């Protein structure tokens, strides 16, 4: 009994050391991820500004701005971590995703999964729910290329191929250090937000159409960055 | 000349009759078996001990090699095979066919 207790007290000490090291490394990577989140703010602000200007000059008939006549499917991009030890992070994200799926069914929409991060793949495979496409291995250090690919696949599915009539993104918003909340945002179709009150080359219809996918890409990139910060 | 170390933890897990394969051993070994049983189950105890060790090791691994996963599958099927209800004896021929 004494030998067992001393062995356990050894294991526990080693685990304490490893977990303290992980806590401090996480404190560092939180700073890194938050710095990245701030670094992408200028591009997001400027693209949003020019998008508002084009929308003011645009016709606002782009497919990403008009609801489908009868929504059958609704894609859901669940952003989860790819490595454990992140507490209830993945659990909260997937609970919010399941709540979103229930809401979608209550609205008649059939959810279809796109999953980021290995852990969500395990969660959904255990529950026999098919993921159409999944991306893994960058939740800790997202680049803009991953966001571009995710947004491209999502927009191609939305335009279409069975396709989807709507698409949401579930991810852990990094409200503050102490608090990180799993939130679901409809990334398409985008609501036109008229509010109280330039030249375009080529004409604002084509420029707006070529810009909107870029807007979705930058918003997905911001979501991935904020999910990484929340994961840390 | 040997042990059949029956474990309460294994008993509750549904591994009945509860032989902890690692600790249990028979030093008479194959000499106390018919040749068919000896040939069919020559390394069964060591294979199951290695399976238990690997199951403890692979409890949370998410990148198990193909050989490791095959070993876990074989070990789990062997564990199910060695389960047996009380008062349900098996003739030696049936035992060799089962372990086969």
């Amino acid at each position: 009994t004494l030998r067992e207790l001393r062995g356990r007290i050894r294991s526990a000490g080693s685990i304490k050391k490893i977990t303290k090291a992980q806590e401090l490394i996480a404190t560092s990577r939180i700073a890194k991820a938050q710095a990245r989140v701030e670094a992408a703010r200028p591009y997001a602000a400027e693209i949003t500004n020019m998008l508002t200007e084009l929308a003011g000059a645009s016709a606002l008939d782009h497919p990403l701005l008009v609801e489908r006549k009868q929504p059958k499917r609704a894609g859901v991009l669940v952003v989860s971590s790819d490595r454990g030890l992140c507490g209830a992070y993945n659990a909260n994200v997937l609970r919010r995703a399941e709540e979103l799926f229930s809401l979608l069914r209550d609205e008649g929409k059939d959810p279809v999964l796109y999953v980021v991060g290995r852990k969500a793949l395990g969660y959904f495979s255990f529950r026999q729910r098919t993921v159409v496409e999944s991306w893994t291995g960058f939740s800790e250090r997202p680049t803009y290329e991953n966001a571009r690919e995710i947004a491209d696949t999502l927009v191609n599915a939305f335009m279409a191929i069975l396709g989807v009539d709507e698409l949401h993104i579930v991810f852990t918003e990094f409200r503050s250090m102490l608090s990180q909340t799993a939130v679901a945002r409809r990334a398409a179709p985008m609501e036109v937000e008229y509010v109280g009150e330039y030249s375009f080359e080529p004409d604002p219809e084509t420029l707006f159409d070529a810009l909107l996918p870029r807007y979705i890409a930058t918003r997905v990139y911001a979501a991935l960055l904020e999910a990484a910060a929340s994961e840390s | 000349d040997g042990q059949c170390f029956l474990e309460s933890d294994l008993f509750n897990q549904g591994v009945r009759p509860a032989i902890n394969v690692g600790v249990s051993v028979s030093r008479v070994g194959g000499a106390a078996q018919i040749k068919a049983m000896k040939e069919v189950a020559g390394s069964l105890r060591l294979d199951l001990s290695q399976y238990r060790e690997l199951e403890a090791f692979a409890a949370f691994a998410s990148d198990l090699d193909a050989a490791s996963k095959a070993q876990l599958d074989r070990g789990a099927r062997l564990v199910e095979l060695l389960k047996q209800p009380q008062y349900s004896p098996l003739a030696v021929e049936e035992q060799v066919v089962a372990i086969f």
Partner: peptide, 29 residues
């Protein structure tokens, strides 16, 4: 025995919400 096992396995029955928006900057549609 192997042939018997295979022919038996042939017949064995296994039991196995925020919303993204574009701000138009004009007051009316």
């Amino acid at each position: 025995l192997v042939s018997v096992i295979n022919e038996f396995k042939k017949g064995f029955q296994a039991s196995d919400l925020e919303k993204e928006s574009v701000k138009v900057r004009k007051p009316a549609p």
